[PDB]
């Protein structure tokens, strides 16, 4: 599951718990807000990634104009994904727990099935919200990738799904072969209670393979040396992105009219699996780089984070909203800024901060659970 760090021990965990208890206090002398005062929406946009970064691809129209405009106005950039054309629930796991996949063993396939059940009292961004205000959504089977079990153990009062739960979507409509993002967005609006501070964990389905769309007909796409099938999949996918682009803009515009501080963490989990490796040419790294933005309905700062991991979203959320952190999220803020996927793995500073994270990550998964004795490590 995961390798034990050489220096894993009860004292090494104590050293870490104290260090970041103090760092949390220092950071908190400058952070103003409390996360529990914002309504937060974690929005996994299935397979969303700007094809402009695919070198050998040409699209007749810009299919992500609105989303790119949103990225310019607030904290936004590229997210490094751990897989290609799949692995949805693994990125999802990393956003909630902030434990990076790249520190686990490569033999792990699905974290929701092989790690989460082995976690004693998993800590998540959702724990700062009341159970009655924790909401999950996914237009498919609630049991896919063990999600129903995950959100039950996290105390979620609702899990809207096409099947496998008491909760259902309303006014279901299809764009393409699957449930539209419009349907998902409006179901989020249907449940936003301004009197309560809520947390939403959303996993869309519109742009999940297979892709079929004949409109907008003017949008056509092609790639160098693609087959007819590859070109047609790319065209259908591009057409479907154009709908998600417009509906995402509308969705955010409707959040501006709600009297409640709302922040959205939007990101594609991975590129669609419709490109051959040749499509990337001189930049094979673009095979695993999706788009993300952290956007609030009030005024938005724009923090400089052009490349981060799915596990960095919560720490970036706290920074964007100037919210006070816990000792745990103080460590994750040190990771976000000084030891994430944008830094060299050979830097001594990166190694040190990553050693702290690995010990913590080992402790709460298949380790001894020393952190149960440091009772303030996960509290603000
Ligand atoms: Mn996916």
Coordinates of C-alpha atoms and ligand atoms in Angstrom, one line a residue:
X1 CA 0.0 0.0 0.0
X2 CA 2.7 2.4 1.0
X3 CA 6.4 2.3 2.1
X4 CA 7.2 3.2 5.7
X5 CA 9.6 6.2 5.9
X6 CA 12.9 5.3 7.4
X7 CA 12.4 7.7 10.3
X8 CA 8.7 6.8 11.1
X9 CA 8.2 6.7 14.9
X10 CA 6.0 8.1 17.6
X11 CA 8.5 10.9 18.2
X12 CA 9.0 11.8 14.6
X13 CA 5.2 12.3 14.5
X14 CA 5.4 14.4 17.6
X15 CA 8.1 16.7 16.1
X16 CA 5.9 17.2 13.1
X17 CA 2.7 17.9 15.1
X18 CA 4.4 20.6 17.2
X19 CA 6.3 22.3 14.3
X20 CA 3.1 22.8 12.2
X21 CA 1.0 23.7 15.3
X22 CA 3.2 26.7 15.6
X23 CA 3.3 27.4 11.9
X24 CA -0.5 27.3 11.9
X25 CA -0.5 30.0 14.6
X26 CA 1.9 32.2 12.6
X27 CA -0.1 31.8 9.4
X28 CA -3.3 32.4 11.3
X29 CA -2.1 35.8 12.5
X30 CA -2.5 36.9 8.9
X31 CA -5.5 34.8 7.7
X32 CA -8.8 36.6 8.4
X33 CA -11.6 34.3 7.5
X34 CA -12.9 30.9 8.7
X35 CA -13.6 28.1 6.2
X36 CA -16.8 27.2 7.9
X37 CA -18.3 30.6 6.8
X38 CA -17.9 29.8 3.1
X39 CA -20.0 27.3 1.1
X40 CA -17.4 25.2 -0.9
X41 CA -18.1 23.3 -4.1
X42 CA -15.6 20.7 -5.2
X43 CA -16.5 20.3 -8.9
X44 CA -14.8 17.5 -10.8
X45 CA -15.4 18.2 -14.5
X46 CA -15.0 14.7 -16.1
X47 CA -12.3 14.6 -18.8
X48 CA -12.1 18.5 -19.2
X49 CA -8.8 19.7 -20.6
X50 CA -8.2 22.4 -23.2
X51 CA -7.2 20.7 -26.5
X52 CA -5.2 23.9 -27.3
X53 CA -2.3 22.3 -25.3
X54 CA -2.3 19.3 -27.7
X55 CA 0.3 20.3 -30.2
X56 CA -0.8 18.4 -33.3
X57 CA -4.5 19.2 -32.9
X58 CA -6.5 21.9 -34.6
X59 CA -10.1 23.0 -33.6
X60 CA -12.1 25.3 -35.8
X61 CA -13.4 27.3 -32.9
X62 CA -12.2 28.1 -29.3
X63 CA -14.2 25.6 -27.2
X64 CA -13.2 27.0 -23.8
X65 CA -13.5 30.8 -24.1
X66 CA -15.6 31.4 -21.0
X67 CA -13.5 29.0 -18.8
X68 CA -10.3 30.6 -19.9
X69 CA -11.7 34.0 -19.1
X70 CA -12.6 32.7 -15.6
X71 CA -9.1 31.4 -15.2
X72 CA -7.7 34.9 -15.9
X73 CA -9.8 36.5 -13.2
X74 CA -8.9 34.3 -10.2
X75 CA -6.5 31.7 -8.9
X76 CA -6.1 29.2 -11.8
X77 CA -3.6 27.2 -13.7
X78 CA -2.7 23.6 -14.7
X79 CA -3.3 20.5 -12.6
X80 CA -1.0 17.5 -12.9
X81 CA -3.1 14.3 -13.2
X82 CA -1.9 10.9 -12.2
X83 CA -3.5 9.0 -15.1
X84 CA -4.8 9.4 -18.7
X85 CA -8.3 8.8 -19.9
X86 CA -9.3 7.4 -16.5
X87 CA -8.7 7.3 -12.8
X88 CA -11.5 9.7 -11.8
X89 CA -12.0 8.6 -8.2
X90 CA -8.3 8.8 -7.5
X91 CA -8.1 12.5 -8.2
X92 CA -11.3 12.9 -6.2
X93 CA -9.7 11.1 -3.2
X94 CA -6.7 13.4 -3.4
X95 CA -8.9 16.6 -3.3
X96 CA -10.8 15.5 -0.1
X97 CA -7.9 14.1 1.9
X98 CA -5.0 16.1 0.3
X99 CA -2.9 12.9 0.5
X100 CA -0.9 12.7 -2.8
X101 CA -1.2 9.6 -5.0
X102 CA 2.5 9.9 -5.9
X103 CA 3.5 8.9 -2.3
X104 CA 1.5 5.7 -2.3
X105 CA 2.7 2.4 -3.8
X106 CA 2.3 2.0 -7.6
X107 CA 0.5 -1.3 -6.9
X108 CA -2.5 0.7 -5.7
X109 CA -5.2 1.0 -8.4
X110 CA -8.3 2.6 -6.8
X111 CA -7.6 4.5 -3.5
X112 CA -11.3 4.5 -2.5
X113 CA -11.1 0.6 -2.5
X114 CA -7.6 -0.1 -1.2
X115 CA -6.7 2.8 1.1
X116 CA -9.8 4.6 2.3
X117 CA -11.4 1.6 4.0
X118 CA -8.1 1.0 5.9
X119 CA -8.1 4.6 7.2
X120 CA -9.0 5.1 10.9
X121 CA -11.0 8.3 11.1
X122 CA -10.2 9.9 7.7
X123 CA -9.9 13.7 7.8
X124 CA -11.4 15.7 5.0
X125 CA -12.4 19.2 4.0
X126 CA -16.0 18.1 4.6
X127 CA -15.4 17.6 8.4
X128 CA -15.6 21.3 8.9
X129 CA -19.2 21.3 7.9
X130 CA -22.3 19.7 9.5
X131 CA -23.4 16.4 8.2
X132 CA -26.8 17.8 7.2
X133 CA -24.9 20.3 5.0
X134 CA -22.5 17.7 3.3
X135 CA -23.8 16.9 -0.2
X136 CA -22.4 14.6 -2.9
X137 CA -23.5 14.3 -6.5
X138 CA -22.7 12.0 -9.5
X139 CA -25.0 11.1 -12.4
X140 CA -24.3 7.4 -12.3
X141 CA -24.3 4.5 -9.8
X142 CA -23.5 5.7 -6.3
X143 CA -21.6 2.5 -5.8
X144 CA -19.2 3.1 -8.7
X145 CA -15.6 3.1 -7.3
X146 CA -17.0 2.5 -3.8
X147 CA -18.3 6.1 -3.6
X148 CA -21.5 5.3 -1.6
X149 CA -19.4 3.7 1.1
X150 CA -17.0 6.7 1.1
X151 CA -19.5 9.4 1.6
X152 CA -21.5 7.4 4.1
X153 CA -18.4 7.0 6.3
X154 CA -17.9 10.8 5.9
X155 CA -21.4 11.6 7.2
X156 CA -22.9 13.0 4.0
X157 CA -26.7 13.6 4.3
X158 CA -27.3 13.3 0.6
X159 CA -25.7 11.6 -2.4
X160 CA -27.6 12.4 -5.5
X161 CA -27.1 9.6 -8.1
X162 CA -28.9 8.0 -11.0
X163 CA -29.1 4.8 -8.9
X164 CA -27.9 3.3 -5.7
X165 CA -29.2 5.9 -3.3
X166 CA -32.4 7.5 -2.0
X167 CA -31.5 10.8 -3.6
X168 CA -32.2 11.6 -7.2
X169 CA -31.6 14.4 -9.7
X170 CA -34.4 16.6 -10.9
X171 CA -35.3 17.6 -14.5
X172 CA -32.7 15.2 -15.9
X173 CA -31.6 16.1 -19.4
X174 CA -28.9 14.7 -21.7
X175 CA -26.3 16.6 -23.7
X176 CA -24.6 13.9 -25.7
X177 CA -25.3 10.4 -24.5
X178 CA -25.0 11.1 -20.8
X179 CA -26.4 13.5 -18.2
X180 CA -25.7 17.1 -19.1
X181 CA -23.5 19.4 -16.9
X182 CA -26.5 21.8 -17.1
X183 CA -28.5 19.2 -15.1
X184 CA -25.8 18.9 -12.5
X185 CA -25.3 22.7 -12.1
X186 CA -29.0 23.4 -11.7
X187 CA -29.3 20.6 -9.1
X188 CA -26.5 22.3 -7.2
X189 CA -28.4 25.6 -7.3
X190 CA -31.6 23.7 -6.2
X191 CA -29.8 22.7 -2.9
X192 CA -27.7 25.8 -2.0
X193 CA -29.2 27.0 1.3
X194 CA -28.0 30.5 2.0
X195 CA -28.9 30.0 5.7
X196 CA -26.3 27.2 5.9
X197 CA -22.7 26.8 5.0
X198 CA -22.5 23.7 2.7
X199 CA -19.9 21.5 1.1
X200 CA -20.6 19.9 -2.3
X201 CA -18.6 17.1 -3.8
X202 CA -19.6 16.9 -7.4
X203 CA -18.5 14.4 -10.2
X204 CA -20.0 15.2 -13.6
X205 CA -20.6 12.7 -16.4
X206 CA -21.5 14.6 -19.5
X207 CA -18.0 14.4 -21.1
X208 CA -17.3 10.8 -20.1
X209 CA -16.4 8.5 -23.0
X210 CA -18.1 7.6 -25.3
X211 CA -18.6 11.0 -26.9
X212 CA -21.4 11.6 -29.4
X213 CA -22.6 15.1 -30.5
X214 CA -23.6 16.4 -33.9
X215 CA -24.0 20.1 -32.8
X216 CA -22.6 22.8 -32.8
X217 CA -22.0 21.6 -36.4
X218 CA -19.6 24.5 -37.1
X219 CA -17.1 23.1 -34.6
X220 CA -14.9 20.6 -36.4
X221 CA -11.6 19.2 -35.2
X222 CA -8.7 17.1 -36.5
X223 CA -5.3 15.9 -35.6
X224 CA -2.1 15.2 -37.5
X225 CA -2.3 11.6 -38.9
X226 CA -5.5 10.8 -37.0
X227 CA -7.9 8.1 -38.1
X228 CA -11.4 9.0 -39.0
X229 CA -12.5 7.6 -35.7
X230 CA -10.0 9.7 -33.7
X231 CA -11.0 12.8 -35.6
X232 CA -14.7 12.1 -35.0
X233 CA -14.2 11.4 -31.3
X234 CA -12.2 14.6 -31.0
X235 CA -14.9 16.6 -32.8
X236 CA -17.6 15.2 -30.6
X237 CA -15.6 15.9 -27.5
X238 CA -14.8 19.4 -28.6
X239 CA -18.5 20.1 -29.3
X240 CA -19.4 18.8 -25.8
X241 CA -16.8 21.0 -24.2
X242 CA -18.4 24.0 -25.8
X243 CA -21.6 23.2 -23.9
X244 CA -19.8 22.7 -20.6
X245 CA -18.1 26.1 -21.3
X246 CA -21.3 28.0 -21.6
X247 CA -23.1 26.2 -18.8
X248 CA -20.2 26.7 -16.4
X249 CA -20.3 30.5 -17.1
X250 CA -24.0 30.5 -16.4
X251 CA -23.5 28.4 -13.3
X252 CA -21.0 30.9 -11.8
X253 CA -23.2 33.8 -12.8
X254 CA -26.1 32.3 -10.7
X255 CA -23.8 31.9 -7.7
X256 CA -23.0 35.6 -7.8
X257 CA -26.7 36.3 -7.1
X258 CA -26.8 34.2 -4.0
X259 CA -26.3 36.0 -0.7
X260 CA -23.6 33.7 0.8
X261 CA -19.8 33.5 0.3
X262 CA -19.4 30.6 -2.2
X263 CA -16.1 29.3 -3.5
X264 CA -15.8 26.7 -6.3
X265 CA -12.9 24.4 -6.9
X266 CA -13.2 23.5 -10.6
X267 CA -10.9 21.0 -12.4
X268 CA -10.6 18.3 -15.0
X269 CA -9.6 14.9 -13.5
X270 CA -7.6 13.8 -16.6
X271 CA -7.4 14.3 -20.4
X272 CA -9.8 12.3 -22.5
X273 CA -8.4 9.1 -23.8
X274 CA -9.0 10.0 -27.5
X275 CA -5.5 11.3 -28.3
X276 CA -2.7 9.1 -29.5
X277 CA 0.7 9.9 -28.0
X278 CA 1.8 11.4 -31.3
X279 CA -0.6 14.2 -30.8
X280 CA 1.6 15.8 -28.1
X281 CA 4.9 15.9 -30.2
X282 CA 7.5 17.9 -28.3
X283 CA 5.4 18.2 -25.0
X284 CA 4.5 14.7 -23.8
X285 CA 4.0 16.3 -20.3
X286 CA 0.8 17.8 -21.6
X287 CA -0.7 14.3 -21.6
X288 CA -1.3 14.7 -17.9
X289 CA -2.0 18.5 -17.4
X290 CA -5.6 19.6 -17.0
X291 CA -7.2 22.9 -16.2
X292 CA -8.3 24.2 -12.8
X293 CA -9.5 27.4 -11.1
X294 CA -10.5 28.4 -7.6
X295 CA -13.3 31.0 -7.9
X296 CA -15.4 32.8 -5.4
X297 CA -18.7 34.7 -5.9
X298 CA -17.4 37.8 -4.2
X299 CA -14.1 39.4 -5.0
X300 CA -11.3 37.1 -6.1
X301 CA -7.6 37.2 -5.5
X302 CA -5.3 35.5 -8.0
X303 CA -2.6 33.5 -6.3
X304 CA 0.4 32.4 -8.5
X305 CA 0.1 28.6 -8.8
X306 CA 0.5 27.7 -12.5
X307 CA 1.2 24.0 -11.8
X308 CA -0.1 22.1 -8.7
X309 CA -1.4 18.6 -7.8
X310 CA -4.9 17.4 -7.1
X311 CA -3.9 17.0 -3.5
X312 CA -3.0 20.8 -3.3
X313 CA -6.6 22.1 -3.9
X314 CA -7.6 22.4 -0.2
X315 CA -4.5 24.3 0.8
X316 CA -4.9 26.5 -2.2
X317 CA -8.5 27.0 -1.3
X318 CA -7.6 28.2 2.2
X319 CA -5.0 30.6 0.8
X320 CA -7.4 31.9 -1.8
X321 CA -10.1 32.6 0.8
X322 CA -7.6 33.8 3.4
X323 CA -9.0 31.2 5.9
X324 CA -7.3 30.1 9.0
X325 CA -5.6 26.7 8.8
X326 CA -5.1 23.7 11.0
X327 CA -1.7 22.3 11.8
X328 CA -2.4 19.7 9.1
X329 CA -3.3 22.3 6.4
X330 CA -0.2 24.3 7.5
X331 CA 1.9 21.3 6.4
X332 CA -0.1 21.2 3.1
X333 CA 0.5 24.9 2.6
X334 CA 4.2 24.3 3.0
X335 CA 3.8 21.5 0.4
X336 CA 1.8 23.7 -2.0
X337 CA 4.4 26.4 -2.0
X338 CA 7.7 24.7 -1.6
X339 CA 7.4 20.9 -2.3
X340 CA 4.8 20.1 -4.9
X341 CA 5.0 18.7 -8.4
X342 CA 6.3 22.0 -9.8
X343 CA 9.6 21.8 -7.8
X344 CA 12.7 19.6 -8.2
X345 CA 12.6 16.3 -6.3
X346 CA 16.3 16.7 -5.7
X347 CA 16.1 19.9 -3.7
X348 CA 16.9 19.3 0.0
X349 CA 14.1 21.6 1.1
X350 CA 11.6 19.6 -1.0
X351 CA 12.8 16.3 0.4
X352 CA 12.5 17.6 4.0
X353 CA 8.9 18.9 3.6
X354 CA 8.0 15.7 1.7
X355 CA 9.5 13.5 4.5
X356 CA 7.1 15.3 6.9
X357 CA 4.2 14.6 4.6
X358 CA 5.1 11.0 4.0
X359 CA 5.3 10.3 7.8
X360 CA 1.8 11.9 8.3
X361 CA 0.5 10.1 5.2
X362 CA 1.8 6.8 6.5
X363 CA 0.4 7.4 10.0
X364 CA -3.2 7.9 9.0
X365 CA -3.4 5.1 6.4
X366 CA -1.7 1.8 7.3
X367 CA 0.5 3.2 10.1
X368 CA 0.4 3.1 13.9
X369 CA -2.0 6.0 14.2
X370 CA 0.2 8.2 16.5
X371 CA -1.7 11.3 15.4
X372 CA -4.8 10.2 17.3
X373 CA -2.8 11.4 20.4
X374 CA -2.1 14.8 18.9
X375 CA -5.8 15.9 19.2
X376 CA -5.3 19.4 17.7
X377 CA -3.5 18.4 14.5
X378 CA -6.6 18.4 12.3
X379 CA -8.5 21.2 14.1
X380 CA -8.3 24.9 13.2
Ligands
LIG1 MN1 -12.7 10.6 -15.3

